[PDB]
Symmetry: C3
Subunit: 71 residues, 3 copies
Amino acid sequence: LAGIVQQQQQLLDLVTRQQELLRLTVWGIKNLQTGGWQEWKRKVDFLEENITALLEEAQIQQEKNMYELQK
Amino acid sequence: LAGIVQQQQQLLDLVTRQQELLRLTVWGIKNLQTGGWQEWKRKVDFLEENITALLEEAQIQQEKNMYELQK
Amino acid sequence: LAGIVQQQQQLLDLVTRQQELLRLTVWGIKNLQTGGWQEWKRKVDFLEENITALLEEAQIQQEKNMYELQK
């Protein structure tokens, strides 16, 4: 199971890095933009906040899984 | 294994949410755009369709894993 | 554990496909862009390189996990 848990850490790191890149693409689009943009912004803001929260929760679950593994 | 299966659900939720954000960034780029854009669109369309299909398959696999766990 | 390992492959495939889509959105933004863009580019380049490396590492870990499973 150590390999499976390690793979989950690698996937978590990948999703975290992809979120960093997504944040940059959103910044880029907002910078180029300055219709339906008002609502676009509201949705993007919700997703960014929600994903950030989910990453934190996934990190906590990773730690619990590692704890149960190490114990 | 319950924690590992739960972590897979959290990663699936993260990728799903990131796809929602990606769909919005693609919408934003298309809106700003209106060269090599014709082919860019074809590739983006393929990826969006393929990822959507993969998310469905991952959800089904998650359910099967949860079933085997619960049983 | 076969189902869990298979689910990790599905998540890896999802993240890989999302990276392909992210690469396209970055290309699109760069094409539309032509301030803080110089640094934006430096950060995006770092993330693209780092994520590519992480995908390779995740693929290797997937293979090791599958090996231990098959053996």
